[PDB]
Structure formats: C-alpha cells, structure tokens
Ligand binder design. Sequence first.
Ligand code: FB2
Ligand code: GUA
Ligand code: ZN
Length: 257
Amino acid sequence: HWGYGKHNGPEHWHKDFPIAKGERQSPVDIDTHTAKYDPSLKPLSVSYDQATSLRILNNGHAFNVEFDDSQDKAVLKGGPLDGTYRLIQFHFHWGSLDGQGSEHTVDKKKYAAELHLVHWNTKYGDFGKAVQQPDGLAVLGIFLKVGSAKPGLQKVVDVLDSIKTKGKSADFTNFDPRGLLPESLDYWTYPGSLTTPPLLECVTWIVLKEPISVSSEQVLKFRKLNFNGEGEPEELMVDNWRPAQPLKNRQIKASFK
Ligand SMILES: NS(=O)(=O)c1ccccc1
Ligand SMILES: O=C(O)CCCC(=O)O
Ligand SMILES: [Zn+2]
C-alpha cells in the first residue's frame, strides 16, 4: 500500500493512481511574484462558531480530527468559492526536522508543517460524492513555523499519546478549530487535488499567507506518532508530505496586494 517510504512514497503513487501525473495536482510551489492579485476575490468567510468535533484518528498517514458534518455547523464560504462547504476533518503534514514538512511551498520555502481544514460542497450531499466533482472540496491550508506555542493546539498535542499507532482513535469533543487560525485571512488560491491517494482533482485550494507559530515541543509530539500499527516495528510518523507538483496550465491568485 502507498505511504511515505523509499519503496511506497510519492514517486511510486502514479502506478496505482495514474492521476498522480495529472493536469491539476497538488501541492504546488507558490511563486509570490507571479501570483496575481485578483480584486474580484472576496474575503474568506470561516464560520466555525458551532463546530462539533467528535473524534481523533491515527489513520496510518496522519491524524484526523473529525467533525459532525450532518448539519450546516462549521462552514467555509466566500473567498473564491461559490456556495457552502462544510468542515469534515482537519489534519497536518509535517517533517522529521523543522526545515521541511509543508506540502505547499512559498518561493521554495518549506515550513515545518501544514494544517489542512477539509470542507465539502453541500451541493453534492456528502463527501464521497463531492470528491468526484471538480468543485467538490475546499481545503484551507495553514503553514506552521516553530517559535512560540499555539495555545489552541495543545489539546490536540496532549491526546496524541492515546493514538500512537495506526487504527487508534479517541473521543475528541468540544475542540474549537478557531484556535488554529492566524490573525489574517489573506490567501492564495488555485485549482488542485487531494495530496494523498486517490489524488482526485476535486479541490479549490485556499492557502493562507500568514503562518501560525507552534512550539518545538508541540511539533516534537507530532513526531512521536507512528505510521505502523500496535505491535509492529516502529516507524515514526514523520515526513508525511507530498512534494510540490508541476503547476502546468494554472494560475495562482492572491486575495491581497
Ligand atoms: N491532504 S488533503 O489534500 O487535504 C486531503 C483531504 C481529504 C482527503 C485526502 C487528502
Ligand atoms: O496504472 C499504472 O500502472 C499507472 C499508469 C496508468 C496510466 O497511466 O493510465
Ligand atoms: Zn492534507
């Protein structure tokens, strides 16, 4: 099965998922000088006041904080989007060292990690149908740099010991994802894909310009997770990021001057 090793990592994925070599793959490098300011782009509307987290899961590739998406409770609107997208889960990608870990890059800069808040377009009824559509998902990407701690991240950090290995989950209620957002909602946007198999070309990417700061201790706890299941040879969950893919025929737009 696919993963992030020499034998099964990103350079192998195309054999089982030929769309890996497609026309709208993610992530990409964001060349800040060639991204065009688009005055037609709207402010992003992030409405997470009623978000209901349920559970946290080690799926063997990352950990997902899952939400109740059975009603319009946590939604993303505006920005480049038409209509309403409902939050289903968030997860991160991160490195073995602070100098790598993000999927998107900015003028070739790699951040220590990247948060993905995943939302599906309500016009398709649920997530599985949405991923079959070119406007099915909106993923809000937020870079992490190492410095001061992010207080709103600590509840996530502290539960990771209980989901060390693949397949473990834990109740994770009342977590407020507003605590993971930076001050500014300035963003870049482009059409792309899931960054893990099945690599479907269904995502409007919205990447925030302003990173959040997390502490070295917080990211070190991410790096204690395991890709393996319980009682299997320990493989630390690090470097679970796909490198930048060819931009091909796409334009990255900026919401800000
Ligand atoms: N990593 S990502 O593109 O946010 C993603 C989101 C949902 C499913 C698969 C991948
Ligand atoms: O299935 C594969 O081995 C990848 C190539 C398939 C294709 O490019 O259509
Ligand atoms: Zn992701």
